[PDB]
Amino acid sequence: KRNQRKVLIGIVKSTKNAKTATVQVESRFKHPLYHKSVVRHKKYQAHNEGEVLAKDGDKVQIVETRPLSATKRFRIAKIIERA
Amino acid sequence: NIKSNEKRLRQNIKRNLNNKGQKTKLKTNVKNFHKEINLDNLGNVYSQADRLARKGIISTNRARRLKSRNVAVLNKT
Amino acid sequence: RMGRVHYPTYRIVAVDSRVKRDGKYIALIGHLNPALKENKCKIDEAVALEWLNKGAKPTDTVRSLFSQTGLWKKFVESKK
Amino acid sequence: TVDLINFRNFGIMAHIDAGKTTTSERILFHSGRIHKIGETHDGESVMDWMEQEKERGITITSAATS
Amino acid sequence: MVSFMTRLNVADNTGAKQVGIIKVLGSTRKRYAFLGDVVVVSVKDAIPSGMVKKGQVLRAVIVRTKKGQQRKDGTHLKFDDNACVLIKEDKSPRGTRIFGPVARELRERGYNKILSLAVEVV
RNA sequence: UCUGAGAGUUUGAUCCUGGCUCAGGAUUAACGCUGGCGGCAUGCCUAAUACAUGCAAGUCGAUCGAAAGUAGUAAUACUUUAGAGGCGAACGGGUGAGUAACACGUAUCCAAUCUACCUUAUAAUGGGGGAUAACUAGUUGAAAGACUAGCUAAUACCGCAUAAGAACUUUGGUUCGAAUCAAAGUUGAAAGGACCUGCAAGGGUUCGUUAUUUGAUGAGGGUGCGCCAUAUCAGCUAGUUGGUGGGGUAACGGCCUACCAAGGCAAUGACGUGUAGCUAUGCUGAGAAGUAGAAUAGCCACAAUGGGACUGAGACACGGCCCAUACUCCUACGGGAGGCAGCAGUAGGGAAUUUUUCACAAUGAGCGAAAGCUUGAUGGAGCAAUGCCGCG
Beta strands in E11-98 (DSSP E): 18-24, 39-45, 57-62, 83-86
D18 a known binding residue? Answer: yes
Torsion E89-E95-E96-E99 (CA) sign: negative
Q: What is the C-alpha to C-alpha distance for residues A18 and B64, in angstroms, rounded to an integer?
A: 34
**What are the Cα distances from residue E95, in Å, to E64, E91, E106?**
17, 12, 18
Closest to E58 (Cα-Cα) out of E32, E84, E96: E84
Domains of chain B: total: 1
**E61 HSE (CA, 13 A, CB side):** 23
Count of domains forming chain C = 1
In angstroms, how far is F70 C1' from E73 CA? 67
Q: How many CB atoms lie within 10 A of CB B26?
A: 18
Start-end of H helices in B36-55: 39-54
Query: What are the structural domain ranges in chain E?
Result: 1-122
Instruction: Enumerate the nucleotides of strand F whose atoms come under 7 Å of any protein CB.
Output: 39-41, 57-59, 83-89, 91-93, 108-121, 156-159, 166-170, 175-179, 185-189, 210-211, 215-218, 221-227, 240-244, 247-255, 262-268, 289-290, 296-299, 310-314, 319-321, 325-328, 331-335, 338-339, 362-366, 378-381
Residue E115 region, left (φ>0) first, then alpha (ψ -120 to 50), else beta? alpha
Residue type, B75: N
* D54 annotated to a ligand binding site: no
D16 marked as binding residue: yes
**CA E68 → C1' F100, Å?**
60
DSSP string for A3-63: ----EEEEEEEEEEETTEEEEEEEEEEE-TTTS-EEEEEEEEEEE--SS----SSSEEEEE
Closest CA to E50 of E77, E102, E13: E13
Domain residues for the domain of B62 are 1-77
Residue range(s) defining the domain that contains residue C1 = 1-80
d(CA B64, CA B52): 11
CA atoms within 13 Å, Cβ hemisphere of B26: 19
R_g over Cα of chain D = 13
The angle formed by the CA atoms of residues D46, E96 and E24, to the nearest 5 degrees, is 85
